[PDB]
Design a binder for this molecule. Structure first.
Ligand SMILES: *[C@@H]1O[C@H](CO)[C@@H](O[C@@H]2O[C@H](CO)[C@@H](O)[C@H](O)[C@H]2NC(C)=O)[C@H](O)[C@H]1NC(C)=O
Ligand SMILES: *[C@@H]1O[C@H](CO)[C@@H](O[C@@H]2O[C@H](CO)[C@@H](O)[C@H](O)[C@H]2NC(C)=O)[C@H](O)[C@H]1NC(C)=O
Ligand SMILES: [Cu+2]
Ligand SMILES: [Cu+2]
Ligand SMILES: [Cu+2]
Ligand SMILES: [Cu+2]
Ligand SMILES: [Cu+2]
Ligand SMILES: [Cu+2]
Ligand SMILES: [Cu+2]
Ligand SMILES: [Cu+2]
Ligand SMILES: [Cu+2]
Ligand SMILES: [Cu+2]
Ligand SMILES: [Cu+2]
Ligand SMILES: [Cu+2]
Ligand SMILES: [Cu+2]
Ligand SMILES: [Cu+2]
Length: 496
C-alpha cells in the first residue's frame, strides 16, 4: 500500500459506498481511505495536509495511528486535546514516528470528535519479514485486507447524537435497505491457495459478527499481537479491533457469502445487506446462493492466547500489581462518566499541559478524568460492565500500550498465566468484570476510552498520565507540533 513515507491530503467530496450519494472525507482523493503499509522497524512520515472546507464534518483534523506505541513520540499519537491540538484547514502537519518491535494489522482514523465516522479511517499493515506465522499462508497483500465499517446516510453531526447505521461496508462497499442493488465487495481467492486475511474494524459503533459460508478461519493475530492459531467459524469483532485469520481456499470453486452481522441497525442479510462476496477464481461473476449454518466454533476471547503464551504483568492473583484501578461506569446529564467524571476535551491538550509545567495528575485538566501512573509499574485496571452506561458492550481501548486481558467478557475466570494481549477489549454486559494489565514503560498521557466514537464524544474516557515527570524528556516535540495550538486557537469557531 502507500507509505511508510507519504502525504495524506484530507478533503471533502461525494461518495456512494452503498449506492447513496453523500459528502464525506476523502484521503488522497479516495474513499474509503487508502491502505498504508510498511515493515517492522520502519520510520513512518505521514504528512497530513488538511484541505477540508466542509464545516459540518469539521475543517480541522487530527489522526491517530491506532495500535502503535509511539514511544518517545506521544505528541504524534493523534487524540485532539490529549496529544495535540487539531491540524487547522490549509495547514499540514508531519507525524514522524517509528514502529520498533511491532508488526501486524493496525488502522488510522481521525481522532477529533466523531470525524472518523464521516470517513477518515483506513487500514494499516506493518509486515514482519520474519513473520512467525508465514508458514501458514501463501498470500498476504493489498487484497487480503478486509475492513468492516458502519455507514450513515446522514453525517455524524447531522443525524442523531448516537445514530444507527444504514449499511455495513466491507472493503468500503455494501447495501442499505434502500439500495438493494448497490455493488458488493468481492474478495478473490484461488482454489488451493492459503490467505492471510487482515480483518480490520473501522466501525464507529456497531460490533460485527463475521463469518464466511462454507469456510473456517484460523485466527493467528489479535490487535497486532501474534496468537497461537485457533480455528473458528465466526468472529465477533468490536469497533477498532483487528484479527488476522488464514483462510484455505479448499472448497469447490464458487461464490460464498461473506457475512458481517452488526449488533444494531439491520441485523439480517436479506437482499445482500451486511454481506460481501468470496469468489474463487473460475466462479461465475454472480451473487452467492450459499446458506448460513450455525456457528459452532465461534471465536472466544478467553480461549485466545499469545504465540509465546506470555504471562500477564505482575503476580498471578487479583490485585497483584503495583497499582490497581477500578473504572466505575455511569451516565448523568446525557454524558458518560467514569468514577463520577465525564471527559470533556480541555482547551490545552493534556500533553501540552504537562510540557507547560503541570507536575501531577491533580494539576491536569479535565479535573477528575486524569490518572497518574507511576513509571515501570504493573497496572491492573478493571472495567466492570454496567447497564448504568447505556449502549454496552463498550469496547475500551488503551493508547500507548497493548495489555493482557486477564478476564474477558462472557467469562468468570482470571488468567494471569497465558492470557490474550490486545489493545481493544469488549467490556461486555452486566455481570462481566473485564480486567486488564499492562506495564508502564511508555511515558506520556495516553487516552483510555470507549471506542464507540459517539460514546467518546459523550465523555466516556479517561487519560492515563504515565510517568509525568519524564514526559518532556522522553517525548521531545517538533516545532510544527508546538505551532498546532496557536494556529488552531486563532481560528474562527466554525473552522475548529
Ligand atoms: C458538508 O457536509 C455535510 C454533511 O455531509 C453536507 O450535509 C448535507 O446537507 C444537506 C442539506 O442541508 C442535507 O439534505 C444532507 O442530508 C446532508 N448530508 C449528510 C451526509 O448529512 C453538506 O451539504 C456539505 N456541504 C457542502 C457545501 O457540500
Ligand atoms: C471488578 O473487579 C474489581 C477489581 O477486583 C473489584 O474492585 C475491588 O473489589 C474488592 C472487594 O470490594 C475491594 O477490596 C478492592 O479494593 C476493589 N479493587 C479496586 C482496584 O478498586 C470490583 O469490585 C469488581 N466489580 C464488579 C462490579 O464486579
Ligand atoms: Cu466556510
Ligand atoms: Cu482507534
Ligand atoms: Cu489507539
Ligand atoms: Cu525508551
Ligand atoms: Cu501551518
Ligand atoms: Cu465534540
Ligand atoms: Cu457498479
Ligand atoms: Cu512486575
Ligand atoms: Cu511490583
Ligand atoms: Cu461505549
Ligand atoms: Cu507498554
Ligand atoms: Cu510495553
Ligand atoms: Cu483513542
Ligand atoms: Cu473559515
Amino acid at each position: 500500500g502507500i507509505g511508510p513515507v507519504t502525504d495524506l491530503t484530507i478533503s471533502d467530496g461525494p461518495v456512494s459506498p452503498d449506492g447513496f450519494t453523500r459528502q464525506a472525507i476523502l484521503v488522497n482523493n479516495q474513499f474509503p481511505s487508502p491502505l498504508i503499509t510498511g515493515n517492522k522497524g520502519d520510520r513512518f512520515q505521514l504528512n497530513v495536509i488538511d484541505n477540508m472546507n466542509n464545516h459540518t464534518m469539521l475543517k480541522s483534523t487530527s489522526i491517530h495511528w491506532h495500535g502503535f506505541f509511539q514511544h518517545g513520540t506521544n505528541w504524534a499519537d493523534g487524540p485532539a486535546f490529549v496529544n495535540q491540538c487539531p491540524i487547522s484547514p490549509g495547514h499540514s502537519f508531519l507525524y514522524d514516528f517509528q514502529v520498533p518491535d511491532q508488526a501486524g494489522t493496525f488502522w488510522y482514523h481521525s481522532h477529533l470528535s466523531t470525524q472518523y465516522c464521516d470517513g477518515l479511517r483506513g487500514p494499516i499493515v506493518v509486515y514482519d519479514p520474519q513473520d512467525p506465522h508465514k508458514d501458514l499462508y501463501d498470500v498476504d497483500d493489498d487484497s487480503t485486507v478486509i475492513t468492516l465499517a458502519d455507514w450513515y446516510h446522514l453525517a455524524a453531526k447531522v443525524g442523531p447524537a448516537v445514530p444507527t447505521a444504514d449499511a455495513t461496508l466491507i472493503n468500503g462497499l455494501g447495501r442499505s435497505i434502500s439500495t438493494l442493488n448497490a455493488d458488493l465487495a468481492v474478495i478473490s481467492v484461488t482454489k488451493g491457495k492459503r490467505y492471510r486475511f487482515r480483518l480490520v474494524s473501522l466501525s464507529c459503533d456497531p460490533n460485527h459478527t463475521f463469518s464466511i459460508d462454507g469456510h473456517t478461519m484460523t485466527v493467528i493475530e489479535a490487535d497486532s499481537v501474534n496468537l497461537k492459531p485457533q480455528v473458528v467459524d465466526s468472529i465477533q469483532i468490536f469497533a477498532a479491533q483487528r484479527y488476522s485469520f488464514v483462510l484455505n481456499a479448499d472448497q469447490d470453486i464458487g461464490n460464498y457469502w461473506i457475512r458481517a452481522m452488526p449488533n444494531s441497525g439491520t441485523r439480517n442479510f436479506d437482499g445482500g445487506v451486511n454481506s460481501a462476496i468470496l469468489r474463487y477464481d473460475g466462479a461465475d461473476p454472480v451473487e452467492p446462493t450459499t446458506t448460513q449454518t450455525p456457528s459452532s466454533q465461534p471465536l472466544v476471547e478467553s480461549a485466545l492466547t499469545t504465540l509465546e503464551g506470555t504471562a500477564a504483568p505482575g503476580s498471578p492473583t487479583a490485585g497483584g500489581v503495583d497499582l490497581a484501578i477500578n473504572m466505575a461506569f455511569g451516565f448523568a446529564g446525557g454524558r458518560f462518566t467514569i468514577n463520577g467524571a465525564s471527559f470533556t476535551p480541555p482547551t490545552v491538550p493534556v500533553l501540552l499541559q504537562i510540557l507547560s509545567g503541570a507536575q501531577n495528575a491533580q494539576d491536569l485538566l479535565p479535573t477528575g478524568s486524569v490518572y497518574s501512573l507511576p513509571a515501570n509499574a504493573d497496572i491492573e485496571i478493571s472495567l466492570p460492565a454496567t447497564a448504568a452506561a447505556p449502549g454496552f458492550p463498550h469496547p475500551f481501548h488503551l493508547h500507548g500500550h497493548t495489555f493482557a486481558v486477564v478476564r474477558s467478557a462472557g467469562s468468570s475466570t482470571y488468567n494471569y498465566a497465558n492470557p490474550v494481549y490486545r489493545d481493544v477489549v469488549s467490556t461486555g454486559s452486566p455481570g462481566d468484570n473485564v480486567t486488564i494489565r499492562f506495564r508502564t514503560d511508555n511515558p506520556g498521557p495516553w487516552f483510555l476510552h470507549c471506542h464507540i466514537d459517539f460514546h467518546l464524544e459523550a465523555g466516556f474516557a479517561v487519560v492515563m498520565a504515565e510517568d509525568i515527570p519524564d514526559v518532556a524528556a522522553v517525548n521531545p516535540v517538533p516545532q510544527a507540533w508546538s505551532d498546532l495550538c496557536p494556529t488552531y486557537n486563532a481560528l474562527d469557531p466554525n473552522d475548529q
